[PDB]
Write a sequence for this structure.
């Protein structure tokens, strides 16, 4: 029993897609037509039954009901896949991406407090918080320190929860989220705490599909970065805290060579005093290099729905 | 950019699909692998940008957020495609389906009160409801009246809402929903009102997408049926009220030849008195013929999530 490649189904696909329809958006029709064709065929090829089909439909409802589509997306490799395509294009244009890009993740929040050169991003509400001095230099496309660059950083606390997405509703707005404008020396410096890794909500749809694939839904500890500056393309990346069990086994496949950074521990009272800290602290250094706009155009910025508070 | 056919992407797809993992469900992985492959390839062939991709992801959260996955499904023709497969299968098996099947729709509710032979389906809460006397005979696979058959019926009121899915939340439990056991003659008879067609929620995700395809989200007036009986397969079908502007332009493509029925208008005082009505009423007669089980089993019953009350 095969009917996909019969005139009836083929003409039906054009109808359902609004192809012969006058109004509408041709780009959407084009994509829908292709998607539907593939799904109708996959249904026949894999002999998907109605029982299976409807199970799939129910999954989509609960996926959206839990607002987890942006979480399952990276878990199924789409996010990394899109970065791969962007790298391939940059390679085509002859652009050398000094600091490699990686996925943004679905937890960015716009509207964080902004300051120049330095900033403390945690509010101390975290008990297990281990002080972390993260700092580096921002280089323009010519390798020269770039003053006035906007560095945006966001990460989870020791429980693996981000502010605005903390189920305990324990965090104040923008905790561990800050924008730092680079100083006269193109430097940024922040005092925060070592983030903990985290996984998908165990009861959530993303995690349960993952179970069906025999995969886990964990991410190693990391720190997200957005770096933008005049005449430069917006850099999206993150750094992985070296030593994490899932550094090279992140369910979001975001890890890359050059993004893994070692956290140096300092117990020496001489260090603890230079860096106005109360006691032992970890230190991480990470410089990032930006690329120029391609003819006054940032050909890789992504306009995507992002929570703004 | 062409990287889909590279070993890097191909292996990645197998990893994301968990094909390499030992745990999980092999059937699920098999499907996931195929779907991701097709989508990844589709993203390449159609050069889908990140901006486009993320709009698609946002749309999905939206769809599930409004619980409209089962409404978009029929709109994109899946529901009908599955029926077509079922007909092809029966055809290959030499089963000529006297009463053509059609889609069930996402609005069935299990638990309706049942009675033998007769029942009034509505509670008269509809101001503009027009009385309808609906009746017919259920015939077995041999063409003989089938007493004890279970006829399940559900439909909307004049505003196009079904009980349990009324936005204006205005209906008595199971209003216009009933189960009837055919009498000593395989007959069923109900008193209710003529349903009005209905469209998808105007501001909902299903309608938003249909607009992009230049299509409407309307269904002609219709009445849903479920007919089951020992020794026979469960029949899912419906009847279309003849004369509806959308009779042959249903956005869910459920209309089939032989399911369009004429509602006969009675106004003469004798018809009014015979049928214990209190004024002019419409009458529709519809007989259904069931098919036999295939080697002891119903090879086409569908088990899908259905609201139960
Ligand atoms: C609007 C357009 C709709 C498009 C949807 C089309 C998809 C069609 C493919 C459907 C594939 C689902 C089939 C899988 C299946 O038959 O069952 C899936 C599992 C169930 O677990 P079991 O143990 O097998 O249940 C059974 C327990 N018993 C044995 C005891 C009864 O549940 C799940 O959620 C896994 C399903 C998630 C698949 C999502 C793919 C989307 C990719 C982005
Ligand atoms: C986790 C796995 C997820 C995998 C997802 C795979 C799908 C990826 C392909 C989707 C591509 C989407 C392209 C659609 C698009 O580029 O724009 C779609 C419309 C927007 O209309 P505009 O007028 O352009 O908006 C702008 C108006 N302004 C300019 C005035 C601001 O919005 C919409 O919601 C329509 C989107 C429909 C796509 C849903 C497909 C699902 C069906 C099975
Ligand atoms: Fe993160
Ligand atoms: Fe209906």
């Amino acid at each position: 029993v095969k009917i996909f490649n019969t005139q009836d189904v083929q003409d039906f696909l054009r109808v359902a897609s609004g192809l012969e329809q006058e109004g509408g958006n041709p780009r959407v029709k084009q994509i829908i037509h292709r998607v539907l064709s593939d799904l109708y065929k996959a249904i026949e090829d894999l002999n998907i039954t109605s029982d299976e089909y409807w199970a799939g439909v129910a999954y989509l409802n609960q996926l959206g009901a839990n607002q987890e589509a942006g979480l399952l997306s990276p878990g199924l490799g789409f996010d990394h896949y899109l970065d791969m395509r962007m790298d391939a294009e940059d390679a085509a244009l002859g652009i050398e991406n000094a600091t490699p890009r990686t996925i943004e993740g679905p937890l960015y929040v716009a509207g964080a407090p902004e300051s120049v050169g330095y900033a403390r991003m945690d509010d101390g509400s975290d008990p297990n918080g281990h002080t972390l001095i993260l700092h580096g230099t921002i280089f323009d496309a010519d390798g020269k320190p770039l003053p006035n660059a906007k560095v945006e950083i966001w990460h989870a606390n020791t429980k693996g929860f981000y502010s605005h997405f903390d189920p305990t509703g324990e965090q104040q707005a923008f905790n561990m989220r800050r924008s730092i404008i680079t100083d006269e020396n193109g430097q940024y410096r922040v005092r925060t705490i070592l983030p903990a890794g985290y996984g998908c909500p165990p009861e959530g749809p993303t995690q349960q599909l993952l179970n069906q694939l025999g995969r886990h839904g964990n991410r190693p500890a990391h720190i997200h970065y957005f770096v933008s500056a005049d005449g430069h393309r917006k850099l999206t990346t993150q750094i992985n805290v070296a030593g994490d069990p899932y550094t090279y086994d992140d369910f979001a496949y975001a890890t890359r060579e050059g993004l893994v950074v070692d956290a140096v521990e300092h117990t020496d009272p001489e260090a603890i005093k230079a860096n106005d800290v109360e006691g032992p602290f970890a230190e991480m250094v990470f410089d990032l290099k930006l690329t120029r706009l391609v003819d006054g155009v940032d050909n890789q910025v992504v306009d995507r729905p992002r929570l703004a508070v």
